[PDB]
Amino acid sequence: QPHIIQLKNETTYENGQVTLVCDAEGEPIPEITWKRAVDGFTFTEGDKSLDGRIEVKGQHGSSSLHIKDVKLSDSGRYDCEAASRIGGHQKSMYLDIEYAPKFISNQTIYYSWEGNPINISCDVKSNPPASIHWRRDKLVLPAKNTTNLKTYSTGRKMILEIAPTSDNDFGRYNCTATNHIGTRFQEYILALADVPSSPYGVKIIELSQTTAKVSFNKPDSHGGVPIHHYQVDVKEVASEIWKIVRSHGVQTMVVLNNLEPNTTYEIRVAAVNGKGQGDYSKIEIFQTLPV
Ligand SMILES: *[C@@H]1O[C@H](CO)[C@@H](O)[C@H](O)[C@H]1NC(C)=O
Ligand SMILES: *[C@@H]1O[C@H](CO)[C@@H](O)[C@H](O)[C@H]1NC(C)=O
Ligand SMILES: *[C@@H]1O[C@H](CO)[C@@H](O)[C@H](O)[C@H]1NC(C)=O
């Protein structure tokens, strides 16, 4: 002895309550300790709680771990440790947490020109797995009287393809997700755009006394908004005149020449298309090598 004789898996739901029970036989009657596996955190009777949601009751033979206001983060493995002096045994169970679908896309606002294709991505996490639909108003998509809309489904993701856009395609879209816990929705926006968005993540990746290579990320319109070229502006920090270098088409690296050694420069990048020039990236500072 001792021997854990009860430690059931449990399934609960977000915002609900669950009680985990562990029973152990043995002589002497063993002390029971709870361990949350993801972070190795220990629970014992009395040992309070920070957020208050979690308490343990009973210490010998049987112990209850009570969690109120269940969070998704409470999901996973919990360990029960039964120990007497003789005197050791551990067992795991898993807490399965169910919940209404949640929308987890990084982007809900999309931009496109007239006449361009664009995919709008609806990303859903739910337990159990949800059914996802796209809708415009009350109409499920694609409608029967359209020839420019398609959907593509992959478990946690449903893509709405609009190819190409016409003006009436702009506006609000409604992505709905449903499981036995509930139905939830998330609105997405497709807006008619003109100039490119701001480039970002600009870095100096090569650097000498008189030259530097700047590299950046294109603004991702997901193909809605064209980029013709980039304008790279460079300026010595106590100088007034921005020197402009155009990129070779849609290349996202540009080599800067004719720099002074040991000199501090500001650099900013903007994308340009047929409708004009977008915002500049956040200004970055570099300093050429000394002689
Ligand atoms: C508990 O759940 C896990 C999977 O999450 C499973 O492997 C195991 O058989 C289940 N039963 C118990 C009581 O451990
Ligand atoms: C939209 O997604 C589909 C499915 O993966 C893909 O075939 C298509 O090329 C994408 N279109 C756009 C607008 O990028
Ligand atoms: C999205 O669709 C769902 C299900 O039809 C609906 O209940 C919800 O109100 C819609 N959202 C909006 C604002 O249209």
Curated annotation (Swiss-Prot):
Residues 2-96, 101-191 form the Ig-like C2-type domain. It is found in: Cell membrane. It comes from the Eukaryota. Residues 198-291 form the Fibronectin type-III domain. Glycans are attached at residues 9, 106, 119, 145, 174, 262. Disulfide bonds join 22-80, 122-175. Expressed most strongly in adult and fetal brain. May play important roles in selective fasciculation and zone-to-zone projection of the primary olfactory axons. This is Neural cell adhesion molecule 2. It comes from Homo sapiens. The lineage of its organism: Eukaryota, Metazoa, Chordata, Craniata, Vertebrata. The chain holds residues 301 to 591 of 837 of the full protein.
